[PDB]
Structure formats: C-alpha cells, structure tokens
Symmetry: C3
Amino acid sequence: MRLCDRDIEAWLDEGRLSINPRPPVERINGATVDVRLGNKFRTFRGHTAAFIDLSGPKDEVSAALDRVMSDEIVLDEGEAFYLHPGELALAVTLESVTLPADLVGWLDGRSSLARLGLMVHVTAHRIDPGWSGCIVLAFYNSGKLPLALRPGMLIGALSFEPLSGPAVRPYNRR
Amino acid sequence: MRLCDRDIEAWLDEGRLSINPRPPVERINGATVDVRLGNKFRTFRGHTAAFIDLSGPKDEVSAALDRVMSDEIVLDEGEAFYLHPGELALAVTLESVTLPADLVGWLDGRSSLARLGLMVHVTAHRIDPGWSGCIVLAFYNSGKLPLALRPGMLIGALSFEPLSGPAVRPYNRR
Amino acid sequence: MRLCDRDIEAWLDEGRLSINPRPPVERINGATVDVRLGNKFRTFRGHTAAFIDLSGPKDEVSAALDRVMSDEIVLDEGEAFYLHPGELALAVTLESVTLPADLVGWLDGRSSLARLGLMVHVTAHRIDPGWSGCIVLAFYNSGKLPLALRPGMLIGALSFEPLSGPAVRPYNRR
Ligand SMILES: Cc1cn([C@H]2C[C@H](O)[C@@H](COP(=O)(O)OP(=O)(O)O)O2)c(=O)[nH]c1=O
Ligand SMILES: Cc1cn([C@H]2C[C@H](O)[C@@H](COP(=O)(O)OP(=O)(O)O)O2)c(=O)[nH]c1=O
Ligand SMILES: Cc1cn([C@H]2C[C@H](O)[C@@H](COP(=O)(O)OP(=O)(O)O)O2)c(=O)[nH]c1=O
C-alpha cells in the first residue's frame, strides 16, 4: 500500500527514507515525490559494433558496450538536450535516493510529457529496497518532433510501498 | 495491497470509489476493472514546429503545443481509428473515474493488444488519489501493421491500491 | 505491500505461490524473483494483411492473426535470437508461474537491458491472481543496434503483492 504524501514526509523525517536534495512540500503530493532531471547524458554510436550480446562473455560485453555508448555529456546552465524522434538516450535524476530494506520505490515518468512522446524507462519501474544513489533514466522519443530536455525540469514521480517485512538481501547487502 | 474484485465492488457500493458508467460484474475480475476506449482522439502535425520545449516559458509552450496537436477527432458509430506503425496518438477512456484521497489507481493496457504492438501510456501508470475524470490515453504502435481501434473496445485494466492513510494533498485539493 | 525476498521463499514453501523450476536463493532478492528467457519465439509477417482489427468479428480476427504471426521459432542450444531495431517480437519466460487467488504478480524487465533498448511488455505489468503458466513476453528494440537474446538469460523480475482478500473471480475460475 503506497505511502500518502504525509507519510512520505514522515519517513523522511524519521530518517527511514532519504531523498537528496530533500524536496519541499510543493513537490510531495497525493502519493508521489516529483523528481528532477539531472545533467549527465549518454547517446549511442552504433557504427563500431554489429550487435550487443546481453548474455555473453563479460570481456567482449564490457568492451562492446564501451564502444557503443557516447562519452558523458554534461550540459552548461541554460542548455537543452535534444532527443530526436526514435532516439534512445540515458540520463540521470537530479535527486539521489536511499531506500531502507522494507520499502520499494516505483518511478513513473510524467503523463504530460508522455503525451508528447517521452517514454522514460518503462520496462522497469522499481527502485529496490537498499538502493542508494541517483536513478539512471532511459528516454525514448516516440513522437514526431524532437523534445528539449533541460537539467532541473520535472522528469518523474516517485512513489513508495512498504514491504511485508525488511528484506534479507536488499541492494546494499548481497 | 490491491483490492480484489469483490472489494472493488464494495468500495463502489460504499460510494468511496466511483467509476462512470459503472462496469458490470463481467468487467470486474481478479484485481482489475476493465476500462473501455472513448471516442475523442488526437494526432500530431509536426510541420508547424521545430521542437517542443517541455520546461520552457508557458507562453510559447501553450502556442507551440496548440500548433502540433490535431483538432479533436470524434468517430461516428461503427468507425475505426487507424493507428499506423510508429505513430503516437491520444485518446480517452470511455469511463470516468473518481478516486478518494486514500486510494491510488494503476492503469495497465491489455497484454493481448500489446502483443500486436499497442503500447498505451506506459511511462505513466498512476491515477492519483483525488483524480476525477476520464483518463487521457497515449497510444503508440510498435508493431508492423496498423491497428484499428473502435470506441467501446476494451483498452485497459484499472487496479486500485489503498494508501497508508488519506492524502493531505490529493488531486482535487492542491 | 510487496513481499520481501524472505516472504517470497515462505509463500513458495507453504505451497501458496508456485514458480517452476524453483529459483534458488541467488535469484530471489530484495522484493523480486529473477525470471529467465524461454526458447519459443514469434515475429510478424505483415505482408498478408493490411491491418489488424482488435475489436472485430472473432472469425476474421483469428484468421488475420494467423497470417501475421510467424510460426514458432525454437532455438537450438547456444543460439541467439536477434531482435533488430524497431522490431516487435514475442517470447516466453523459462519459468512457469502459479499464483493463488490473493496475490497479484508484477513483471518488470531488467533496467540494464532497457538501457540498451529492450522494452519488454510494458503496457502490461500484471500477472493475475489465479494465473498459472508461462508468461508471454513482448519485446521491442528501441535502441540503435540489434540485441542478441539467448534462452536462459535473465529477462525480468517478478514481484508479488497480496490482495486485500482472495479474489472471487481469479483467472482459473471465470
Ligand atoms: C497515467 C495517467 C494519468 N493520468 C492522470 C492521472 C494523474 O492523476 C494525473 C497526473 O498524472 P502525472 O503522471 O502526475 O502527469 P502530470 O505531468 O500531468 O502531472 O493525470 C491520465 O490522465 N492519464 C494517464 O494515462
Ligand atoms: C503482463 C503480462 C500478463 N500476462 C498474463 C497475465 C495475465 O494474468 C493475463 C492477462 O493479462 P491482461 O493484461 O488481462 O491481458 P488480456 O487482454 O490477455 O486479458 O496474461 C502474460 O502472459 N504476459 C504478460 O506480459
Ligand atoms: C527502474 C530503474 C531502476 N534503477 C535501479 C533500481 C534498481 O534498484 C536497480 C536495479 O534495477 P533492475 O531492474 O534490477 O536492473 P538490473 O538488470 O540492473 O539489476 O537499478 C535505476 O537506476 N533506474 C531505473 O530506471
């Protein structure tokens, strides 16, 4: 059962859930905390590789994945990242997030950006008990026009669901 | 923890969750209420704009978004909407939905349409405590062939999860 | 509220949730059971049909869908299935899954494959109370390069949420 907004504020106070920087009350509502776009991106350069073998020898995998991914792109103040129709790109939330062993996060993108084509990371919704860090975001433009994305914009909504008990093998321990 | 079918029927009876028109027992099963496709659509006309700036000056934004979106398309009885491969379109559920401050909805599309390419709105699953209205749907054809969509068809499944208490800032109040 | 890893192990022991073959402790962590890719695939052959009418006369529907879908593709040991950019394909989990009437499953794909383009089945997350069987997976490559998928690879994560009571009309009974 999701935490309502005021229980989120509670868990943040007790020190049992951490979100950094801490979002003000404006950005905690209903059952979600709004999260923000960070300033570190990546694109793909397919030309160096014929395919990616997901389940294969971690040698060739490491090095193939090293070829295909752009170097980190960091945008100066007031600069957009243009995500063109049909492009997949990686970015990161502005906020860091630390979950205890008895809470799981679910990240949704914003419905109003998805109406213009933005699918964020959408084969995976789940932030694990124990997770501590930024969240890697995978964007895909499924609309006709390019979409300009600026660091600081609202990019998603985080909701939190207590588990039936504290996980034995959370992220930090395993 | 999701409401099972018979608790959904309960909450609808107590007057604590509203779905309009009210779906019969056929369309409430397991842990979901089947929802239906409405009769109001939109497509994109990119030609008037170079991009969309999501986080930018609400003036230019309003007017850019005014250009790019088709006018409302309403289908006469017995008429299909053809969603061609690679097209993003907006539609609406037939049913209206009103949630109390201590319940959150999650909308999934139907697995059997997704097997033919239909991604519905899938960067966002969440209907907020306090939401009252139709649900805007964003479709994308990810398959090879066009898909004919007729108002009244089953288009999704709504499930409901009580919150840990009533939200302080639900949709209606904020 | 999701089952943590050790409650999943409990429900599997009590005989109240079944996953076959049973995954070892390595593959149950936090709040999910890792699931594996099976060895039965399908692709599309659009050339025989102009469109698919989802909501139409189950005669023509059966036969149209019979045309468009490839025959079952079964991969010999050590063989990949190449899913090319922009292709939608169907596969199946290696594990079978049987849920009781008071538990609902949610399947997420893996975040690390989605970073390379793999959207799995993502308009639908939900395994119903009463479901018993393999899970049909719908893949879509949203990246630049083809992705090689081998039977046995990790393909997803299953999490489980008790309902507010046992469903009256679960999958097996309705
Ligand atoms: C997921 C979804 C939500 N909504 C509704 C439910 C939410 O309560 C509300 C807002 O969802 P939200 O994801 O917060 O998007 P936004 O950027 O508009 O705030 O809109 C839809 O109309 N359609 C959808 O497909
Ligand atoms: C989400 C998902 C569900 N299922 C199963 C689980 C559900 O219990 C069942 C039905 O899901 P549902 O979304 O109701 O699709 P449909 O139009 O076939 O009724 O199929 C899959 O086989 N694969 C999937 O990827
Ligand atoms: C869904 C999501 C998860 N994560 C985090 C949360 C999870 O705790 C963790 C692992 O998610 P998981 O789906 O298990 O992917 P993987 O193949 O890497 O194990 O990564 C992200 O960084 N970004 C995301 O978009």
